[PDB]
Design a protein around this ligand. Sequence first.
Ligand SMILES: [Ca+2]
Ligand SMILES: [Ca+2]
Length: 282
Amino acid sequence: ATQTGATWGLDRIDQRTLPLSGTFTYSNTGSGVNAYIIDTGIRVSHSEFGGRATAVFDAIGDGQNGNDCNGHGTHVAGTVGGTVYGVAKSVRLYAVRVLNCSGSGSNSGVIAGVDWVRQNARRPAVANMSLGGGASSALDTAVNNAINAGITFALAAGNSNRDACQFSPARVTAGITVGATTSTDARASYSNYGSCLDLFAPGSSITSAWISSDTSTNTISGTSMATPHVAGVAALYLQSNPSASPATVRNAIVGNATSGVVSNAGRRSPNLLLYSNYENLY
Ligand SMILES: [Ca+2]
Ligand SMILES: [Ca+2]
C-alpha cells in the first residue's frame, strides 16, 4: 500500500536517498504485533488509534489510569502505529505509563513498567522507551532482562548533544538505540551520538497525535520522536518474522539501514539511517 501526502518522517524511511517523495509505502502493517509504549501514557480514544490502543499499566497514581496528560506518549504511540502518522498501521498499542503530566517519573516506576512488560507482554512484542536519565544499572538490568525475555526494545539516544553511552537506558547494548535526524539528513543539533547508537531515524519536526482532543496533532522534535519510527519498523519486521529474537530484529534493522547519508553524525556514530523496505517471496 502507498500512502500519499505522508508526513516527512514516514516519507523518509521508505526510501534510501533524498529528495522526499511525499509518499510512504508499506507491505506489512504490524497486524498481530504488540507495541508497549513506555512513556507518559496514551490518549487511547484518539482517532489515530482506531480502537487499537489500550491502557495497561500506570506507576504515577494520579488517577489517569494510563491516560496521557502530557502529550509525549500519545505522539510517540502515533508514530509507531497511528493510521495517518504511524509506521505500523495495524499494530496493537499498549500504554505503560511511567511518566506524569510534566513528563517526569521515578526511576522505580520506570523499572516497574519495564518489568511489567517483561512479565505480561503478548509476543511478538516491541517496547518503546522515548525516555531516559542518569546512568542506572538497575534500569539497564530491567531493560536487559526484558530483551532477554524476547522483547525488542527501541531506546532514545537522548537530547544533550553528548555521547549517549553516559545515559540509561540508551547505553544498553542489546536495545536498539536511536539518534535523530532532520529532513535534510543532518544529525539534529540536540541529538546524542557515538558508539552506543545503532542508527538514526527522523526526529526533528515530527507530526503525530496529541492530547488536546481526539483529532489533535502536534509537531515536535527529539530523539523521542526518532525512536518510534524504529519501533514501528520492528513491528513490520515482526509481522513477517514473529519468532525473531531481539538480536535478529536488531541485526535486520541495522543491516537494512541506509549507509553514509547522515551529515555531521558525531564522533564514533554509526552512519546509518532507518530504512523500512524488506523483500518477500512472490
Ligand atoms: Ca518516501
Ligand atoms: Ca543500544
